[PDB]
């Protein structure tokens, strides 16, 4: 069936500038009898259902800002977003409404390029309630940084931990265009009690030099 390929896969563009997102179909989706290209464009913000921006390739749905425009014909289409706003952060999809299965493109992730922001760093010791259960989770928080890139290091008594921590990062914030990251170090209570200095080391662009937040059992 009809394949739709978007380019690029991910797009990083600056506030106030213009974003250009292509969709190519494996065959024409112009319906002659309607004189329409049957292509839809959607925006899907973090944690939301998709929102329809454009249908028939170039017709905006009411309520959608005129910053969003669709163009193209036949097998080649483009979504343009003028004067990017922080809230435009989202994954954008094209979809053909020409013949079932009404297939979607693979999506284009839009990242907002903003000024570099340093992460505020915090560490959290395990709770007594958890320790009672036999496990110790140590959490490091890097709050509101940009860009996404960061190395988070766990040092136990200054040793360098590998393969016993997990990270989760939020979606780019819809307002300040920053990310936050959580790192969790997980050890048994037994292993946890045999050490004193737990350290989370954070290196980032917005950091003059690495920052260490730590605690002593």
């Amino acid at each position: 069936d009809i394949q739709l390929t978007q380019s690029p896969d991910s797009l990083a563009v600056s506030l106030g500038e213009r974003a250009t997102i292509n969709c190519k179909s494996s065959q024409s989706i112009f319906r002659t009898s309607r004189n329409k290209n049957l292509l839809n464009w959607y925006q899907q913000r973090p944690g939301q259902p998709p929102r329809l921006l454009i249908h028939w390739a170039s017709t905006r749905k009411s309520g959608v800002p005129d910053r969003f425009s669709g163009s193209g014909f036949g097998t080649d289409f483009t979504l343009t977003i003028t004067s990017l706003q922080a809230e435009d952060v989202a994954i954008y999809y094209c979809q053909q409404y020409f013949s079932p299965p009404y297939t979607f493109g693979q999506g284009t992730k839009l990242e907002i390029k903003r000024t570099v922001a340093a992460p505020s760093v915090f560490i959290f010791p395990p709770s007594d309630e958890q320790l009672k259960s036999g496990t110790a989770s140590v959490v490091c928080l890097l709050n509101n940084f940009y860009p996404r890139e960061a190395k988070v290091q766990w040092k136990v008594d200054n040793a360098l931990q590998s393969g016993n921590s997990q990270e989760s990062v939020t979606e780019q914030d819809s307002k300040d265009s920053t990310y936050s990251l959580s790192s969790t170090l997980t050890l048994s209570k037994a292993d946890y009690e045999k050490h004193k200095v737990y350290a989370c080391e954070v290196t980032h662009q917005g950091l003059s030099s690495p920052v260490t937040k730590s605690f002593n059992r």
Partner: protein, 211 residues
Amino acid sequence: EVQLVESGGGLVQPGGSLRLSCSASGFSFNSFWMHWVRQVPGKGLVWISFTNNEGTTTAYADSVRGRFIISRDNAKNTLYLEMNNLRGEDTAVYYCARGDGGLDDWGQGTLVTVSSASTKGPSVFPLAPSSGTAALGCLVKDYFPEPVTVSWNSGALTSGVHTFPAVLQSSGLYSLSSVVTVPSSSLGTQTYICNVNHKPSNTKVDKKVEP
């Protein structure tokens, strides 16, 4: 308005069956095509099925044809998707959508988890305040299946709140954290409680976070 509400999603055994419902309001239901679309969390939208106005024409994605059956009850303003012989690859959020010029309106979606793993409710642990500004939170550990929701002070605290996407652990159980930053001074004067809800296990917890 237009309101669509999917229901019927949850944890189901591989090979088993489920039937999703989508309740429609705020428009002339029998006047529009209706669609089902799915999405593995973190991944793309995948078109699943549609039916024309009277349900006399339908179609299905290649990967579900012969396994799924879409239907609609116009008198009842309800769309259905019967899903049989479910596979791990069918795990996704399922959306119903009203067709017009495009798929113009979408429900919030319902999560279908196809797995032989047991339902397990989370433990909820405090992340003790770090102290200017202070950070505190809740670690929601060791649950299955997704999802969990978290709020703070019954939704009264929203500014500065970061609820991280869940991570699948080595044990095959999920874990997530919700944190929030607040003025270090308010630690002395303000009560902070994360409200956790893991509906799949009927687990609702309110955990006071204090120094």
